[PDB]
Amino acid sequence: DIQMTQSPSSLSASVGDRVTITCRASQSIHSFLSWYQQKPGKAPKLLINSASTLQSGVPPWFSGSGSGTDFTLTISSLQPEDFATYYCQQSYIAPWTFGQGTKVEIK
């Protein structure tokens, strides 16, 4: 494998705004892509698995979509808890790389 990149590296939004974040792949990666959440100084949180399935206890306003090489995340309305980072990985074989993430700040 995974050679990942994403854009934009920073974002500015208020409460209730529709935000998005896109990370793409160089080649076919199918559709089992995850989305993560990370607060500063705390444990990471999970939001989306396999780019279509919403887990139990995760609120439904986090929605993901995408197939093939292009992927995206969609939030219907921002929340005070939603100001954090995002990541997207894949586990086809076992080398381990990492991305650069993004940031959402108060405007």
Partner: protein, 123 residues
Amino acid sequence: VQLVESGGGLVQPGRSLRLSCAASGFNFDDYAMHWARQVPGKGLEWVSGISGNSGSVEYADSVKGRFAMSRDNAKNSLYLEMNSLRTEDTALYYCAKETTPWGIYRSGGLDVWGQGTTVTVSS
């Protein structure tokens, strides 16, 4: 048990739009499949549905007389038609088959959700 929906779009209030919900990985039976919608910031709801053996139509209070329905079992797909649209119909339509239409106690189904295609209305 995978359901894929298509047919949404951005239309004015009053213009119809024929969407779809295709059932894949579904063994053929008398499944009663329903609809629901989601607004940002609140919980869940339910709209209407049709049971098996054709016929057996029902709706809610505010969606009667303006929803057209037809089911084709050969294509494993559904055609649904709108009429006299309003401003509260900005919905991402989910089809949920409830996956247990047994001969005895056909009610109490376990709803399974699809993906949906967004429909946006704007005056």
